[PDB]
Amino acid sequence: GMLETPVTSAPIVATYLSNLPAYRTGVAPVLRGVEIGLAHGFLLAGPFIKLGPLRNVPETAEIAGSLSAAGLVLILALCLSIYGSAQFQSARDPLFSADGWSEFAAGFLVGGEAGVAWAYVCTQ
Amino acid sequence: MKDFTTYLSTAPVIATIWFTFTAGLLIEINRYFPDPLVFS
Amino acid sequence: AKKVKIAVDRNPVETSFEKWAKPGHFSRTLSKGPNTTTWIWNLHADAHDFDSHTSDLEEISRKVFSA
Amino acid sequence: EVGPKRGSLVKILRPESYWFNQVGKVVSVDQSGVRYPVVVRFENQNYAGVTTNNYALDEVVAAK
Amino acid sequence: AHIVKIYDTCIGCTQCVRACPLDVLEMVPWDGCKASQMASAPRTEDCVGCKRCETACPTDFLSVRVYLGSESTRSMGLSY
Amino acid sequence: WTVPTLNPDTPSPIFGGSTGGLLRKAQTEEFYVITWEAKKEQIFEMPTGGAAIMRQGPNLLKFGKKEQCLALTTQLRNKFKLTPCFYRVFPDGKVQYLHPADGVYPEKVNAGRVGANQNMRRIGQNVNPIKVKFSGRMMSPAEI
Amino acid sequence: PFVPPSWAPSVFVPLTGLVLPAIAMATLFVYIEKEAP
Amino acid sequence: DIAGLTPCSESKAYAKLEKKELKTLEKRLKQYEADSAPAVALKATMERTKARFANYAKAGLLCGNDGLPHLIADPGLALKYGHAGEVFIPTFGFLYVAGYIGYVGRQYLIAVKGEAKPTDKEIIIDVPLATKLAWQGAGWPLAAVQELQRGTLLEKEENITVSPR
Ligand code: CLA
Ligand code: CLA
Ligand code: CLA
Ligand code: SF4
Ligand code: SF4
């Protein structure tokens, strides 16, 4: 069969993945979308603020960077939505279905924008 | 000796001798008649 | 426990210009002579590919050593 | 009793043949009524390295 | 699927069948040649278009011809 | 000769495994199974890379595409002088048998085969492309 | 009458360079992936 | 003169060019000894430079505003004003040699086609035959024309292979 390897087949690694929102079955797709969106949204603000074109402005740097992070989350939400449209047109997990993914994309937008907003509040 | 003279008759050997001769003739002509541009 | 020793064969090959006058002698395919210009390139491409001329490792090693 | 004699030279008339309008030597002629009985050999090989080919009676004519 | 055609100049050498790396061709009885056999192409849906058969045909011009056509998972030679 | 029936419980060669094996295609579209009898345990080369030991008696392998199965068949037949046969297996459980289609390898002529895609003309006697134009689809003169 | 407002580039450049391409790409991606009935 | 050109012997720019080249050589000369090896070589170069500029002026070439010789290619203008040696005469000089080489090679190629194994006579040259044909090529224009009139120069259209059409 496939080449067995500790990275591919280990107990500690398997348990960690099984607890991630993507692999945690039994949770509504919308809730998983919010949980995933919040994590990525919070991180997405970092690089924009520190290395953006307005990074050296004292107070505008925080606003401009976070506002650009919010924009990227919006673009990503569109990518999630159209992916579901193309992939699911006609199985065990509800997420991998036309109905499930549409809820998942909506949750990501809500969670992602909340994470970006929450990141801004931490700064000020 | 027949085979050796046959080897000298191979295409690469003939070309080397022929162009060595041809080049030498042209080089020698330009040594005694330097800078020919017009027949005159 | 094969002892380390000098081992040679006497007069393995004859020194003659006969094969100098027969291009492609080293290979069975090219020994028949040219029919297309592709033969000429094949002669130079495979000249030093000893491992394909013969399947005998001893003959291959002796050519490498003298080359 | 059918086709040219063995060893004679014939000119090929198949337009799609590598040896169209070229002369080859007849090796044998099948007498079993096959589609292409005549076998011709050529001194110059084609692009695949082949020097022999089968031709029908009407695809080959005597040299000149 | 590609298109593979056998023409009546086949001499039944079987070289095309041996060359084919997907068992697309086979030999069948015939009366049009000395060998009394002809090449056949019953399984062209498995043909990939390598043209190893054409490389192996002795007749001039070829007696087996491959015309590349519509692509698919099998003809595109994909394992994924 | 009758069409063989595949035995899914046939033992497989001694192979550690590799990354060149089946992919997600096998679970969704199809895969191929090759089986043969081995006179003695021997080492052969996997078309996916590496070396495997064939058990004495029946052996079974699974491959991702047909060409891989027929590549192993050429090795076993030509070098070890065996006689393998392989199938096409679908995810629904259906099994299709092929090579040898009629039990005799295609290189050998066999009575009962029906000629297919045979044109009773030469390549030079095809019609011109203009005469097969507007036939509803791109059609070569050889097709008609 | 013809002269557009002085702020026209501010709206149309982002609109035609960032917004319409996004909708156009989404429209095309969905279209090509769409399966026949 | 012709096309607005002027004889190099009467050209101001042509004369100035010679001084520039000699001045460059003289500048390098004064860093050596009187009769050292480098000095002798430089003096030899200057002699050839002076000879070259005298020869081109003596040849009656035409110089442009650049002060460099220009050649006349029209046969009518060349023969009209005595410039036949620039292009016109060398034209028939080259063709004789070019036809010589080509005619000799064609004779050899025909000669070996009659042999049992023509291919082996091409990689391994038949030197005795080649030398024989090399000398007889001096009369190629006469032999070439006579073949044309007797109709044995060209192959018949029916003996040449061509692709389907
Ligand atoms: C790879 C090459 C590269 C890099 C490193 C940069 C870097 C930068 N560019 Mg430049 N740029 C590049 C190529 C690059 N550029 C090219 C090719 C062009 C021409 C098209 C430009 C044109 C350009 C412009 C026009 C501008 C920049 C700007 C910037 C700055 C901000 C970029 C930003 O907002 O990123 C946002 C970053 C992210 C969203 C994330 C980055 C990737 C993260 C860090 C990956 C982390 C992975 C992590 C480690 C994985 C963990 C796994 C684990 C959990 C298991 C920054 C200094 C801006 C500026 O003001 O610069 C001073 C700016 O205005 N760039
Ligand atoms: C015509 C096309 C176009 C346009 C209009 C822009 C515009 C911009 N680019 Mg560029 N960019 C483009 C093409 C374009 N880009 C392309 C093709 C590439 C790839 C080669 C890049 C790569 C690139 C990089 C790498 C970077 C830029 C950046 C920027 C910003 C520079 C000015 C600044 O300081 O912003 C400051 C920005 C703000 C103060 C915020 C503006 C608004 C944000 C981005 C979105 C807000 C969305 C809103 C909250 C919610 C949705 C609203 C919507 C539905 C209407 C600006 C937003 C820099 C930047 O800062 O990016 C974020 C930057 O680093 N661009
Ligand atoms: C490659 C083509 C070509 C071209 C464009 C020219 C061009 C020219 N030639 Mg030349 N010529 C050429 C080839 C060419 N020639 C060839 C191959 C030969 C034979 C070897 C000649 C022989 C020749 C002679 C004998 C004369 C010219 C002359 C001329 C000039 C005027 C007459 C002329 O030929 O009109 C255009 C050219 C053509 C239509 C092509 C055929 C030209 C024939 C062969 C010559 C015509 C001469 C003409 C009747 C002279 C009348 C007196 C004149 C002062 C008006 C002109 C610069 C005359 C001259 O010196 O004028 C100053 C002149 O006397 N040419
Ligand atoms: S198609 Fe060619 S290779 Fe195949 S049987 Fe016919 S002649 Fe032989
Ligand atoms: S093209 Fe390849 S797969 Fe198709 S018949 Fe020829 S050899 Fe077989």
Side-chain angles (χ1 to χ4, degrees), chain D residues 9-12 19 21-25 40-44 63:
Chain D
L9 306 179
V10 295
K11 182 184 172 184
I12 307 308
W19 297 283
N21 286 7
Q22 307 200 52
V23 187
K25 184 174 290 186
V40 185
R41 180 174 304 282
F42 306 91
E43 304 184 19
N44 54 323

Side-chain angles (χ1 to χ4, degrees), chain A residues 16 43-44 46-55 68 72:
Chain A
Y16 167 74
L43 305 171
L44 207 65
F48 285 105
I49 296 170
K50 258 59 185 61
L51 297 167
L54 299 175
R55 63 201 155 86
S68 59
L72 185 57

Side-chain angles (χ1 to χ4, degrees), chain E residues 6 8 23 39-41 46 62, chain F residues 66 99 116-119 121 123:
Chain E
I6 313 297
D8 61 356
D23 185 1
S40 186
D46 293 323
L62 300 164
Chain F
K66 185 181 180 181
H99 190 70
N117 299 313
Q118 293 174 344
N119 298 10
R121 64 179 190 276
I123 286 172

